[PDB]
Amino acid sequence: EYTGITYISGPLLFVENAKDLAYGAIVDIKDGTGRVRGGQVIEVSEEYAVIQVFEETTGLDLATTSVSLVEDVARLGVSKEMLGRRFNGIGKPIDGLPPITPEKRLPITGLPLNPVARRKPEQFIQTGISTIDVMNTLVRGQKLPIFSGSGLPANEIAAQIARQATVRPKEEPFAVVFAAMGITQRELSYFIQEFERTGALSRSVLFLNKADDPTIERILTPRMALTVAEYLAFEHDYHVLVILTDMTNYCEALREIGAAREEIPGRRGYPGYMYTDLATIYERAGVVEGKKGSVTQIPILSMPDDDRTHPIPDLTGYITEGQIQLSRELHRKGIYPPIDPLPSLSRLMNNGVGKGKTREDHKQVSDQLYSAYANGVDIRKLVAIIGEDALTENDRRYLQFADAFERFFINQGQQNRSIEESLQIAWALLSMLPQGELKRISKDHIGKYY
Amino acid sequence: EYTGITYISGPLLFVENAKDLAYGAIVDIKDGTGRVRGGQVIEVSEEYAVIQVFEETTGLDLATTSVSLVEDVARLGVSKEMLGRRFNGIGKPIDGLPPITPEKRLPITGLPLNPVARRKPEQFIQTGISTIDVMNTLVRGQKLPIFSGSGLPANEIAAQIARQATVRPKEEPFAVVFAAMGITQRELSYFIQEFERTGALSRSVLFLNKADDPTIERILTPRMALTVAEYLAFEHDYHVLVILTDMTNYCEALREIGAAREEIPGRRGYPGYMYTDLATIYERAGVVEGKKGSVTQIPILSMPDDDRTHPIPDLTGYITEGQIQLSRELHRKGIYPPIDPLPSLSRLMNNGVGKGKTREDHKQVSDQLYSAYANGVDIRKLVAIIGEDALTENDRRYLQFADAFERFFINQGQQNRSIEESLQIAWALLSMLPQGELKRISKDHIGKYY
Amino acid sequence: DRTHPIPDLTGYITEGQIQLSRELHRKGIYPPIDPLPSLSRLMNNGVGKGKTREDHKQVSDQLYSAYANGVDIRKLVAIIGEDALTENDRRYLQFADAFERFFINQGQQNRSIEESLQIAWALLSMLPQGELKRISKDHIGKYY
Amino acid sequence: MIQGVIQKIAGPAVIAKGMLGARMYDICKVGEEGLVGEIIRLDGDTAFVQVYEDTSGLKVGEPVVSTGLPLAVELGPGMLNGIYDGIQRPLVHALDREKKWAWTPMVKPGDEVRGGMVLGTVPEFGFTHKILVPPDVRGRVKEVKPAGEYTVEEPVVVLEDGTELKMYHTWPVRRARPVQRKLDPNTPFLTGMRILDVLFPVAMGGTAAIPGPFGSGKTVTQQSLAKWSNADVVVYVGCGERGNEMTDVLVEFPELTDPKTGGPLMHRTVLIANTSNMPVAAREASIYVGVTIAEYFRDQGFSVALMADSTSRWAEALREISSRLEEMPAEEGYPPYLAARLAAFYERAGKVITLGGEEGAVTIVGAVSPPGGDMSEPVTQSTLRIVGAFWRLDASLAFRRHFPAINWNGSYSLFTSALDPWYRENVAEDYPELRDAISELLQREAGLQEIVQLVGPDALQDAERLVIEVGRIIREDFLQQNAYHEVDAYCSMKKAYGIMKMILAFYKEAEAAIKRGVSIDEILQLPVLERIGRARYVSEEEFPAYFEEAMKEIQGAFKAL
Amino acid sequence: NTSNMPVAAREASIYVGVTIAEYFRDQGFSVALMADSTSRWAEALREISSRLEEMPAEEGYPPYLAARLAAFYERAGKVITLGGEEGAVTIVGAVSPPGGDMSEPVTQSTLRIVGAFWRLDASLAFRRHFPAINWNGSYSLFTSA
Amino acid sequence: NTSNMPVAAREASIYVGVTIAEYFRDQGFSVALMADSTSRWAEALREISSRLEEMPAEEGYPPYLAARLAAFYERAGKVITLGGEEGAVTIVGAVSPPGGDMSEPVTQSTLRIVGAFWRLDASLAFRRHFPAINWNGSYSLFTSA
Amino acid sequence: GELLVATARTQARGEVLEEVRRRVREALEALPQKPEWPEVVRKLALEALEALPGAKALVANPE
Amino acid sequence: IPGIRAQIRFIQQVLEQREREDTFRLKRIKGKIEARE
Numbered sequence A, B: 001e002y003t004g005i006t007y008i009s010g011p012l013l014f015v016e017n018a019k020d021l022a023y024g025a026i027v028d029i030k031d032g033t034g035r036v037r038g039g040q041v042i043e044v045s046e047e048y049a050v051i052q053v054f055e056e057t058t059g060l061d062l063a064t065t066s067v068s069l070v071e072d073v074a075r076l077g078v079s080k081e082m083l084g085r086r087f088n089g090i091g092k093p094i095d096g097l098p099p100i101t102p103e104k105r106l107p108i109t110g111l112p113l114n115p116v117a118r119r120k121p122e123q124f125i126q127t128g129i130s131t132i133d134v135m136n137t138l139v140r141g142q143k144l145p146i147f148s149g150s151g152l153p154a155n156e157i158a159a160q161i162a163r164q165a166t167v168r169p170k171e172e173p174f175a176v177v178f179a180a181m182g183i184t185q186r187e188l189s190y191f192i193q194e195f196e197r198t199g200a201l202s203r204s205v206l207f208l209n210k211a212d213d214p215t216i217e218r219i220l221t222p223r224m225a226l227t228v229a230e231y232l233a234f235e236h237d238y239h240v241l242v243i244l245t246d247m248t249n250y251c252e253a254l255r256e257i258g259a260a261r262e263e264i265p266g267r268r269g270y271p272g273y274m275y276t277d278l279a280t281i282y283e284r285a286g287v288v289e290g291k292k293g294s295v296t297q298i299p300i301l302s303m304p305d306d307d308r309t310h311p312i313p314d315l316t317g318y319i320t321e322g323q324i325q326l327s328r329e330l331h332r333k334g335i336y337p338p339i340d341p342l343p344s345l346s347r348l349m350n351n352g353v354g355k356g357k358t359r360e361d362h363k364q365v366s367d368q369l370y371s372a373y374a375n376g377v378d379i380r381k382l383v384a385i386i387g388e389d390a391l392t393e394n395d396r397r398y399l400q401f402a403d404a405f406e407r408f409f410i411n412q413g414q415q416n417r418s419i420e421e422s423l424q425i426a427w428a429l430l431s432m433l434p435q436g437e438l439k440r441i442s443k444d445h446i447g448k449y450y
Numbered sequence C: 001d002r003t004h005p006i007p008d009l010t011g012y013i014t015e016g017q018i019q020l021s022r023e024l025h026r027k028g029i030y031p032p033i034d035p036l037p038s039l040s041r042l043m044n045n046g047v048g049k050g051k052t053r054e055d056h057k058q059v060s061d062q063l064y065s066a067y068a069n070g071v072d073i074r075k076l077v078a079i080i081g082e083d084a085l086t087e088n089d090r091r092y093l094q095f096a097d098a099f100e101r102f103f104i105n106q107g108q109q110n111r112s113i114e115e116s117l118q119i120a121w122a123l124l125s126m127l128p129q130g131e132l133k134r135i136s137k138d139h140i141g142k143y144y
Numbered sequence D: 001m002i003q004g005v006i007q008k009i010a011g012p013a014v015i016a017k018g019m020l021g022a023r024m025y026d027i028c029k030v031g032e033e034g035l036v037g038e039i040i041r042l043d044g045d046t047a048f049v050q051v052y053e054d055t056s057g058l059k060v061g062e063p064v065v066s067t068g069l070p071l072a073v074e075l076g077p078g079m080l081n082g083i084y085d086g087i088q089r090p091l092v093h094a095l096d097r098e099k100k101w102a103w104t105p106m107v108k109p110g111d112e113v114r115g116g117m118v119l120g121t122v123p124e125f126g127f128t129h130k131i132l133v134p135p136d137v138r139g140r141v142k143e144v145k146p147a148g149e150y151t152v153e154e155p156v157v158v159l160e161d162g163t164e165l166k167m168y169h170t171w172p173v174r175r176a177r178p179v180q181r182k183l184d185p186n187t188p189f190l191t192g193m194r195i196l197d198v199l200f201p202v203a204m205g206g207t208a209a210i211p212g213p214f215g216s217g218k219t220v221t222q223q224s225l226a227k228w229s230n231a232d233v234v235v236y237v238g239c240g241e242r243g244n245e246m247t248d249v250l251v252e253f254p255e256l257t258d259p260k261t262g263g264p265l266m267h268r269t270v271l272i273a274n275t276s277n278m279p280v281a282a283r284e285a286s287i288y289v290g291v292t293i294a295e296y297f298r299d300q301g302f303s304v305a306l307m308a309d310s311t312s313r314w315a316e317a318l319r320e321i322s323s324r325l326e327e328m329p330a331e332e333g334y335p336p337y338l339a340a341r342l343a344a345f346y347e348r349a350g351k352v353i354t355l356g357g358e359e360g361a362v363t364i365v366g367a368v369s370p371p372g373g374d375m376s377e378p379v380t381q382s383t384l385r386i387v388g389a390f391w392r393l394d395a396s397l398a399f400r401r402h403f404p405a406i407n408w409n410g411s412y413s414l415f416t417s418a419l420d421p422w423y424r425e426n427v428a429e430d431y432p433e434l435r436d437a438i439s440e441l442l443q444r445e446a447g448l449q450e451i452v453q454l455v456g457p458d459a460l461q462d463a464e465r466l467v468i469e470v471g472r473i474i475r476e477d478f479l480q481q482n483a484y485h486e487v488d489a490y491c492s493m494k495k496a497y498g499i500m501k502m503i504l505a506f507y508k509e510a511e512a513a514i515k516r517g518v519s520i521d522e523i524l525q526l527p528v529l530e531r532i533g534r535a536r537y538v539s540e541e542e543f544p545a546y547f548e549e550a551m552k553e554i555q556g557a558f559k560a561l
Numbered sequence E, F: 001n002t003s004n005m006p007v008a009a010r011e012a013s014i015y016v017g018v019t020i021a022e023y024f025r026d027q028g029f030s031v032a033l034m035a036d037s038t039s040r041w042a043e044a045l046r047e048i049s050s051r052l053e054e055m056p057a058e059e060g061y062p063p064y065l066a067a068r069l070a071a072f073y074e075r076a077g078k079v080i081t082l083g084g085e086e087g088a089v090t091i092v093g094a095v096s097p098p099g100g101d102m103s104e105p106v107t108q109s110t111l112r113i114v115g116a117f118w119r120l121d122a123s124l125a126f127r128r129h130f131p132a133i134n135w136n137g138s139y140s141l142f143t144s145a
Numbered sequence G: 001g002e003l004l005v006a007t008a009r010t011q012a013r014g015e016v017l018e019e020v021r022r023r024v025r026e027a028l029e030a031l032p033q034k035p036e037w038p039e040v041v042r043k044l045a046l047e048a049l050e051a052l053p054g055a056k057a058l059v060a061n062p063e
Numbered sequence H: 001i002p003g004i005r006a007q008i009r010f011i012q013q014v015l016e017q018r019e020r021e022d023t024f025r026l027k028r029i030k031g032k033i034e035a036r037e
């Protein structure tokens, strides 16, 4: 059925229909355009008029311009053949190959499949990075954010995990879904070249959204990516790892339209709905029904203005099972990866460690390293207050342990550390502390492992 | 005359009248309800429509539902028989007794009676608490706030003053008006039981507003209380002490509606009118015409988030003659009452002390105790710096005096101390200091009282 | 507050800035000009041979550098004590006082550029000649 | 058009509805598609409805019907082990109509009854369900079923010669169930966690806010309480779920065990999910549905715990509905109406004397999640003003591996005095004095550390170094608890006081030794100290033996001088 | 981009320049695009937006700015021009915060896009240390590149 | 200017007083205008402004205050009255910052207008040095005059 | 080399889809020059008025 | 050591300067958006 534009303000277009109103979420097509221009219905205003959001620029639209209702929302051309292809935010080819030949056509909001099981995340994902695998282990079904800031190599880490990740002897096949949002042409060319050269592309679906692509296409990008992941995990029984960079850039686009949508702004100018839209993305992870597959997320959260309390990064923390927080201060000291060892945590961590998973002493070692590093970092403050020479012998050992933790445990010369390798480094650095000061390691473990 | 609802949004209901508009503040009654539902007129919108605020839930209201105008607000049923009764924020019985039999029916905004004289507050009110009577004397006609924070026993202090306060040989009878706002059912049951058991109820009118009572009833509570106080003071010649807890909770309710009223918010989200509404309450205190009676206020001001600079507590300071500021830090050191001795002021103390009020040596003793306690507290720092043994003999006495002040003067085993009792303890602890070190007590007082 | 948006946006509209400081005024130094925050944007277009004198840029650079070092050393004196300052630093400390007493301070008085350069060279003598990093040797021999 | 209506318009999230002449303000309404909505605006010619889901499933002309509730809920046999949602219904009916329950008569014909009176008993699930005369019904029992088996719909009794009573009853979730009197806070809600039970007590029927930033351990306090608190039933409103926190609980909790019995915890729990795909309406109503179910169980004479994940997200869902209704935004764009509402919720908490005597209670533990550390509006600010208790998980305490990560300086109860007598009578006569003494220790440490931050630690006297030494032992040996250790995961009341007395006894001895010129360095390396440090790992009273081991060791230090 | 010129022209100035810049790199030249500055371009754009009644956000700037500014800097790069040959457009943009605040518009959004930042330091300048580039606060993600 | 009085009246009080003051100087009298205080007058004005929904600035005070306060103090002076003869209005205004902060409203704007400032010093008072005027922090730009 | 296969299948698989489409469109393009075309044309216009729109008129080629 | 508290004190007040006043150009901007709308 056809309608006519009655109003245009930036990305928001009002459209009046004389017969049949299109339901909320339907994709409408603007007639008379050189390139396809989609309008997604957002509201019914009354008087046979709907309010919509454009998926591309609205320059050149005129009042009265015709619009058709496609009869459905937007969708994913789902197939195992998604693997090995590079696509746009909307799932259109970017690799000069033919459009996907769908096995099924899936809605992308998260309603399709109802894939998740009511079971806890478990079992190992080997990223090949020691500071993750050894100390902050990623588990199948978990959401473990990379917490960073502008100027830091968060995307290098994301790309490296995409190249290296596997599920060591699993009966299930492994796949990566890599989605980039609001990236430059240079960054897009780099990501493409990297996937193609390494042969990482063979087991990956890649979605790339450029900075100059429509804001609506950026909003749809993570939904295309999560739908592909859920399809591969649930219908093909795969352990799928989804890497989303950067959630902050996704948020800048969603925030950009909230104003055009008529909402009263919330703190820091953000959309009032920040946490319930973001929840639609972090809810989509975990073991899938059947327990053959799973969806794991590694979202990148850059601090705007390096502020971890900004509403975007701050609301993302609850959606994760492991967090890796990068710090500019640490990067400026030449410590890479620039991980803050006292602000990186593991959640569902207890479900993926111990005898029969990693090793029996894993929790004790993790607890002791965390405690000693936190004490050592506070003592850096105490050194500044009193002077190095006024520090007690015992405190000096904890001060030194913090440097050892940073130099040897956090720092990896790019290098795929097994959990055994990571625990060994952990025990080696722990030797710097007095044995009498290992409050968080039971004597059984000291005798067996020290 | 009858009207019809034209709009309902939560507590705000618009009502259109074809004949006779009800004036602002009138109580309207919604027809067709199982339990009485009052609507208080707040504004005249134009077009014969008024905007109102509901005193109970609006679920089940329909557009067109009928409403009658009662012809009046709420109002105070004034009588000497108000004494000995417990009432709601609106002056309805809570004690299972009959409704008040009015001698006069008074408006409650402060316009009735025009009771105040253009004379300064004077003469003693014995609270029975040494830290008030001795050092920060409450005077008849004064406004002396209790300045506290969440978790602190400000209500215990308020209740104790209600039980103990008197006007020592005055030819005039004494009465208490105790008003509580936004309190729990548990707190209401406790306050009731306390007044009834002690026999404090015999000389008190008590108004209790619960957290779940209508917000408008909370706003009216302090006005019912002040009107009763002014009636007893002016028409019956009584010295009346009004205790209002908590002004911050009153403010949370007034702030809650400012948004529904269409105002642009001021700092910290507060109503732009914060200071000119609050002024309508703090203006109502002082000696009454005839100089037989007076109205004194002890408002409780809890710091939201412990911030004494929040606009609510900060604007209240100007309305007081004595301020008692409680501090969480002090409470956490086990010092009770948790009064900050360097932030409590006889903003009006000098007007309620001396010969014919308390005793001639009161100012000198208060000055000396304050000076010695402040020196003693600084010396606790000096002890930490140099060690106890390196402190001079003279400083050791001041150090010890601070402990004596805390152990014996601040600490009360719940106990109603007369000002004479409080000055006696003060002189007893002062003996610990060298007589040659009593710089702030004239020799005349040392000879007579030491 | 020199960072308030009004004064801060005005800086770009200028070719010379003279910044006055309350702290300096409270020390009795008038005019209360901050010698390390007053600049000339187009200064190089109005100085040198045929305009002022050939050594003008070098002298201006050296006085600015020495005064800035001397002011920082006032902080170092407060940190360590006067007696713990090196002999070399003491000269720079003293130069800052000399710059303020003799160059900044004028007893109301119309100084020619020749007069101003002369005072500049006179105060510069307080510094070790080996410490005049910003004055080429050609100028030292000709003007020192 | 009294009970039903027809959609006039939809878009911009509000459905305008013609009719529904008898709908109440704030009633749930049902669209033909199956979506629910809340009646927000009642106008002379329409009802404005907030839709709790996607509005494209609503079209002009669609039929809309009343539900009649702020309520309702079914309250009878079949509630236990059951999993419902925001408006009670299998995760549709509510109570099985086919299931047969063994009814046991507890009243004879001729007995006079009143609302709340117990007429029968049903061992539906051990638990023994108590059949009560619905509130507002009294008279004489004219007919009563004999001991047999019956379905819910069957009539088991008649009163006043014809009101008919069944094993279940309905009640408006929006209306707090009646009671004779709400007993003042008197009985502690025995948590089993030393810091809580000792320093920041929660009273049975108390409201104690749980507040702090994301990932501080707020939910975990709640979950441990349910696994071990002295409430028979738990009502978990696992709101603010996202990414997979839904599936994280979907197939997980169904395996979590009841430490008390060794059976599934769900066997005494009711889950109320609040996912992001759910309308703001449903999440808004979720606390009211839960509290009503909570009040229902306390009516039986049970002590129930209501855990609210969280109210920050409920206020965001409410702000979305309000802004869509064009209500005037205030601070952080929140509607003016929130403070009175939130307070009204927490007011429904309390230990009462149920209808027909007997005592029960609903204790509320609410999670606080400010937009991000700001800890202002919505959640925190308004909540911390209502609640009597606040357990502040501290991220810095957590990073330091001090568990539970509850800040003993920023937390408060208002239940400490309320529960002290339970501890004094059942556990230890010196519970209150001991926790006050430890807190004064921690308070003194805080002050000392502030000064040391300025003038350094070199000037510190031996007396001040001792206080830091013992203060540190309190933090490491007491405050910190290992949730991952098979033993220290739970610390029985008896163990909590015994560890406290070992620490406090070491303190007294420490201060006594210093006063006699014993070097603090000598005390700091005292052999018993390492044992005191591992005391939390001992599951036997071998812990109180440490007191005598401490005294003799100090004597060996009084010997050497 | 003078003050008497409409906000429109100054807004379009970076786009006219970048297009001319891209034109020369197409020939196989390496061109440098120096943008005095984007703080003033965002003020001209905020004036146009407010006149169009678009909803003001932080510092009253329209929501649309971050995506736009990024889109500009994305047109930078060394390419293989149409018909082979290599050329490039390097961008150096000036940052002028309202006054030392170094927040919005300019700085904040820019420092998030750009790969290089050369921090002239007024204290380094007063000290006569030239170039006055702070070697502690500056960064090139390009060092390894 | 009591607390029960509208912000309006207290706002107008300095203008009513100054006019009466100017009236007496017109006769050829030297009058002193003592203003207890302008901090409270600016708080009454901020209440009126916020109720009128005028945009709050620093400490939530309206932008309009500085020009107004200055305009008040400008009406001070010794004049040659209409029909010759000399008279004058000398103003002494009290300054009461929110609390020691000595910023806005009162102090800040006032100390910028007034030519004289007599700083009562609480430490000078505690030391029993009267008048408690700090001879180091007080100033009169009239010494030479 | 593994990628070197998948793409060579993709090109082949493409070519076949693109020929199935070529034909499907040849069918419709040469549809008017046969019978049963009139019954098609009317049935299209039927739905135009049969759908949401109220009645008025329709248009086509002059054949 | 009263050097610490000294110039480092300048420290706390440029710090404090920076934002109870900056944090305020702001509670009030956002008012300003739909405060102005």
Ligand SMILES: Nc1ncnc2c1ncn2[C@@H]1O[C@H](COP(=O)(O)OP(=O)(O)O)[C@@H](O)[C@H]1O
Residues within 6 Å of the ligand: A318, A346, A347, A348, D212, D213, D214, D215, D216, D217, D218, D219, D220, D221, D403, D404, D405, D481, D482, D483, D484
């Ligand atoms: N008592 C505890 N013992 C050990 N780890 C804990 C504890 N509480 C929280 N944590 C750690 O912090 C994480 C976040 O806690 P959680 O309760 O889920 O956060 P929130 O405050 O957001 O509800 C837990 O998953 C665990 O990793």
